[PDB]
Design a protein around this ligand. Structure first.
Ligand SMILES: C[S@@+](CC[C@H](N)C(=O)[O-])C[C@H]1O[C@@H](n2cnc3c(N)ncnc32)[C@H](O)[C@@H]1O
Ligand SMILES: C[S@@+](CC[C@H](N)C(=O)[O-])C[C@H]1O[C@@H](n2cnc3c(N)ncnc32)[C@H](O)[C@@H]1O
Ligand SMILES: C[S@@+](CC[C@H](N)C(=O)[O-])C[C@H]1O[C@@H](n2cnc3c(N)ncnc32)[C@H](O)[C@@H]1O
Lengths: 217, 213, 217
């Protein structure tokens, strides 16, 4: 197959390997971003995993802006019931990558369309929402934030990973994301030292986010 | 101590269920709750790996002392035990008495059958000896319909009684149940070897999924 | 009595018409009969533009006989489209049929009444239409049903049979036999799935147009 050379492999701690196609269909290319690799590998760290059953085992996980589905697929191999979401245009790629990794899934995974800011069907709030490199343009602001607010419950653990970009308007977009995020959410950056020892970077950040509860309507 | 029913777990720890609280109401641990609680610990129900209930959402209806829901919480479930307003103090007392064994979570709520529900469908709904009077019919069934989703596993354990109105109630229950739900009796051979009776049945119940709900 | 003011309210099945108005079908009388998925498919098929046709509705001012009516869903839908309907079933279902007529009489633009018709018995002029939903499931659905169908239908009767294909148990054998007997006195054709209501359809639910044969001798 000519497309086999466009597969990106991501090794799991247990020696198995996730294989992510980055092009399909008559459609679109999507890279496996470095931020997705960092987040994926973070999910396999002993400290995130915990003792006994992995932290994600039997938990509901929604990924926003999944792209190749890398992160959500990692979560599915760790026992989560995952929904990977993105634009209509990425659905074929997501489904291909589910089919390439079917044997490694220990929980469940399915692909759905979720365009940020649009009305939701996903009524019950997930245990986790995962995002990798979703903070880079206008939609990453108000529409992404609306989706996060509408979907998350007060117990939802939201984990956001992104690579800091210094080029152009990106520093102002990043600042604004976090300035607006704090209006409806509390957040904290985790230390680099909690990331996977190899798959980490000083310019790639993992942020824990939780919905704020106001006592007044 | 005076009114405690002790229920031993397979792992050798013990659930302690107060059957009365000061100024409040009495509620016995019924035989059906014992049968159902022990059934949850059977090897076939528990399954491989983590127990079938671990990290699963469980709602109990007509919890009384909270016996069955507390058993589930000790098996790793996130449990809500429900009953009438009048049983809330007893439920909270029994949560406190057994919280050192809870590996999931447990909380008490009021849920009077047939009333408007205040959201996500649970993985399991458990009922022990809830089939015995008028409210066990349309109101209970309405609650079951309102709360359950197509993937909810409903387990209903009851003691068959020949006395009084009970045969008519049991009969009408299953007639009404058939409309919106599929159900099957679990053979007696699958109950705990000791904690079982030919007169105590365990029914698995599942909501029928129309293609056009 | 019950704590509930109207204890059987939650056993009413609601079916929305194309114009938004709702049909209400009680499913418990004292004896229960649910609204089967086939009844919903066939009911919504009767409302499709192609079936409805141009001008006045195809059923408008036409005689319709329903066999094995149950709740009366399909016959009631036809009555809301202008047909003069008789819904029929066993004696034990008459109260339910009449209850459901009363609950929907305000939407009736033709007419509807309930009668006993137990299959394979002696009949009391041929209708323009005969409708059947999920009537092929057991021993009597064969010789007695088909005998009634032949006895009542005329050469101009449009017989429409809708059913959900069941694969468990003795069902495929019952289905086989239904069609082995049907071919003897009737011609029939399955209508394409694409002619069914776009929302209210399924690959496993079939609509069959049936017509009484005329031998030359
Ligand atoms: C930079 S990528 C990250 C992909 C993947 N998470 C990774 O880290 O490898 C951004 C992703 O967000 C998706 N996306 C962008 N705008 C969106 C919107 N308004 N609604 C939904 N998804 C969107 C894109 O299609 C793309 O797959
Ligand atoms: C016979 S007991 C069974 C108690 C417990 N499950 C056991 O087996 O030990 C019936 C329980 O149902 C509760 N109950 C009865 N009617 C109820 C209603 N209408 N709504 C909610 N709970 C009710 C009672 O308060 C009581 O705790
Ligand atoms: C599965 S139901 C379908 C009901 C309804 N048409 C629907 O689709 O929801 C079968 C119906 O056929 C009726 N029936 C079965 N045997 C019959 C017979 N020998 N004569 C008349 N009706 C019969 C039953 O009473 C029942 O109402």
């Amino acid at each position: 197959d000519p497309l086999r050379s466009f597969v990106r492999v991501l090794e799991k701690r247990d020696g198995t390997v996730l294989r992510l196609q980055q092009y399909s269909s008559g459609g679109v290319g999507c890279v496996v971003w470095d931020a997705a690799i960092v987040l994926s590998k973070y999910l396999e760290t002993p400290e995130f995993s915990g003792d006994g059953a992995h932290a994600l085992s039997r938990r509901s996980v929604l990924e926003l802006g999944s792209g190749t589905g890398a992160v959500g697929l990692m979560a599915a191999t760790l026992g989560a019931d995952v929904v990977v979401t993105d634009l209509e245009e990425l659905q074929d790629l997501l489904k291909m990558n589910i089919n390439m990794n079917k044997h490694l899934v220990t929980g469940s995974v399915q692909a759905k369309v979720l365009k940020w800011g649009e009305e939701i069907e996903f009524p019950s709030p997930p245990d986790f929402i995962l995002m990798a490199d979703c903070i880079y343009y206008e939609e990453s602001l108000e529409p992404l934030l609306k989706t996060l607010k509408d979907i998350s419950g007060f117990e939802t653990c939201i984990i956001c990973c992104y690579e800091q970009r210094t080029m152009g308007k990106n520093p102002e977009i990043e600042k604004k994301y976090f300035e607006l995020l704090q209006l409806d959410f509390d957040f904290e950056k985790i230390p680099l030292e909690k990331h996977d020892e190899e798959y980490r970077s000083e310019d790639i950040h993992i942020i824990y986010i939780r919905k704020k509860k106001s006592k007044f309507p």
